């Protein structure tokens, strides 16, 4: 059915793309077998503060399977200027810088 928040690290496939619509589309590869789980992703201003400032366009990002190597597509509306796309937390948290002109 469905579990908590994904506990394993993710991996970015390619590089976030500009949709020319003010949003970015990125593909992630999940490495865990604990799904179905919710993807911990967010658009924050600085790494010094993980308070979500941007907004997810994709509805409640999820890994729908309990098999590894699952890939998920996400569209976000990061704030203007600098921000980071952060996935995961703790020791398995990863981020990707971004700047919206």
């Amino acid at each position, epitope marked *: 059915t469905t*579990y908590g928040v994904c506990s*394993k*690290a993710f991996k970015f496939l390619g590089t976030p793309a500009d949709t020319g619509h003010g949003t970015v589309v990125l593909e992630l590869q999940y*490495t865990g077998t604990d799904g179905p789980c919710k993807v911990p992703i967010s658009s924050v201003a600085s790494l010094n503060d993980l308070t979500p400032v941007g907004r997810l366009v994709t509805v409640n990002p999820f890994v729908s399977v309990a098999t*590894a190597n699952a890939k998920v597509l996400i569209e976000l509306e990061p704030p203007f200027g600098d921000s980071y796309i952060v996935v995961g937390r703790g*020791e*398995q948290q990863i981020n990707h810088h971004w700047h919206k002109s």
Partner: antibody
Amino acid sequence: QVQLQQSGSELMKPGASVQISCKATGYTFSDYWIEWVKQRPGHGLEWIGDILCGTGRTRYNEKLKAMATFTADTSSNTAFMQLSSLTSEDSAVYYCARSASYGDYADYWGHGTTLTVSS
Amino acid sequence: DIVMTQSHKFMSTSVGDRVSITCKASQDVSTAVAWYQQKPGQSPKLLISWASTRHTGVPDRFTGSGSGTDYTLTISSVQAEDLALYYCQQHYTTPLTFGAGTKLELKR
């Protein structure tokens, strides 16, 4: 330095119940899954189950003829495994392993604690 | 559950040669396979994760490769310190399963 110190080997009466401990140090205890792997002397490796120390979520190899229970004491950063109704079948070296951030593979193993079920 | 079957358990090779212990999974484990090395009276040691990712503290003479259902652990220029038991493990889904292991032996 990530390291796992397990409890010492032990001889238990069949039917009895035992608790193997696994003290984690050198890393954020709660952000990982501790795996429990079994290996009977002449056999290979078999997955007993794991536990997400940070949330307490457990996953057991349901099909194993053994009653296992995982608990994580985030206060002492120690993962335990309770094994009840012991059998000569459960006699084996039990390993404590840490599940890597990048998948259900273990990157750090304890030196294993040997459990012998015998009268 | 997913069954992991490795190539013949008692394989031989000569120091310096190249060997390959194979691992077959009863189904596509989507590249999610790891290899461990276990020396007499020692805890298993992680060698490869995700078919080809070489763990640190692991000499590059150890390379893994694989996908779908077949995975190979190649040891280029085998050494005497490589004598050990080698297991593959799929990390595609629970329950996690290991191969019976392959014992590397040398011809001299």
